[PDB]
Amino acid sequence: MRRSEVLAEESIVCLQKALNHLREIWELIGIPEDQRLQRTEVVKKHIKELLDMMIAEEESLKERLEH
Amino acid sequence: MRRSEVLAEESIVCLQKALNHLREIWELIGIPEDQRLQRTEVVKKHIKELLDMMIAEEESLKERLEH
């Protein structure tokens, strides 16, 4: 994000912990594995939101310097 | 998430990748870094949302197999 990458790295360290404990819970409760992919696919769409702001941050904020 | 850990691990590759490219844009545009940590803090808060699901999945969805 800025040169303080450490908060973003902690954010995805924390998602790495969380996705492992969610998968221990899967193997423990035995909920259908289709609801779990939709839970992963929404963690991934929040990162697709971060891809969308990024292609806007290069194209459009470089264009804040232009206009 | 389920034992397909891969779909979520690739979600956080793609964030790790994006957050570095967003830091390249920081060194280039020189937009004030307080917008960038608000961008980081919202990426983080989407993982807090995932923490809040998971504590509800162990406490409350393990109790869903109970009752």
UniProtKB/Swiss-Prot annotation, chains A, B:
Identify the tissues in which this protein is expressed.
Overexpressed in bladder cancer cells.
What kind of modification does the protein receive after translation?
A: Phosphorylation by CDK1 in early mitosis holds PRC1 in an inactive monomeric state, during the metaphase to anaphase transition, PRC1 is dephosphorylated, promoting interaction with KIF4A, which then translocates PRC1 along mitotic spindles to the plus ends of antiparallel interdigitating microtubules. Dephosphorylation also promotes MT-bundling activity by allowing dimerization. Phosphorylation by CDK1 prevents PLK1-binding: upon degradation of CDK1 at anaphase and dephosphorylation, it is then phosphorylated by PLK1, leading to cytokinesis.
Q: Where in the cell is it found?
A: Nucleus; Cytoplasm; Cytoplasm, Cytoskeleton, Spindle pole; Midbody
Physiological role: Key regulator of cytokinesis that cross-links antiparrallel microtubules at an average distance of 35 nM. Essential for controlling the spatiotemporal formation of the midzone and successful cytokinesis. Required for KIF14 localization to the central spindle and midbody. Required to recruit PLK1 to the spindle. Stimulates PLK1 phosphorylation of RACGAP1 to allow recruitment of ECT2 to the central spindle. Acts as an oncogene for promoting bladder cancer cells proliferation, apoptosis inhibition and carcinogenic progression.
Q: Family per UniProt?
A: Belongs to the MAP65/ASE1 family.
Instruction: Please quote what the entry notes about the protein's domains.
Output: Microtubule binding occurs via a basic patch in the central spectrin-like domain and also requires the unstructured C-terminal domain.
State the oligomer form and interacting partners. Answer: Homodimer. Interacts with the C-terminal Rho-GAP domain and the basic region of RACGAP1. The interaction with RACGAP1 inhibits its GAP activity towards CDC42 in vitro, which may be required for maintaining normal spindle morphology. Interacts (via N-terminus) with the C-terminus of CENPE (via C-terminus); the interaction occurs during late mitosis. Interacts (via N-terminus) with KIF4A (via C-terminus); the interaction is required for the progression of mitosis. Interacts (via N-terminus) with KIF23 (via C-terminus); the interaction occurs during late mitosis. Interacts with KIF14 and KIF20A.
Task: Return the protein name.
Answer: Protein regulator of cytokinesis 1
Record gene name: PRC1
> What is the covered span of the full protein?
1 to 65 of 620
